[PDB]
Design a protein around this nucleic acid. Structure first.
Ligand SMILES: [Zn+2]
Ligand SMILES: [Zn+2]
Length: 45
DNA sequence: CTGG
């Protein structure tokens, strides 16, 4: 879809789809033990 | 925009 992947960089898909290795922690937030949104990725408030 |  002409989108660069969060942790792989290659386009035509998204992080999870990319064959390359996945990020251990949250992509947007970094932390570990959850998805991307669940963690303080963007001031949950 | 896209999400594990
Ligand atoms: Zn990728
Ligand atoms: Zn996080």
């Amino acid at each position: 879809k002409n989108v660069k992947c969060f942790n792989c960089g290659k386009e035509g898909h998204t992080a999870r789809n990319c064959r390359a290795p996945r990020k251990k922690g949250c992509w947007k937030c970094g932390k570990e033990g959850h998805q991307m949104k669940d963690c303080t990725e963007r001031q949950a408030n």
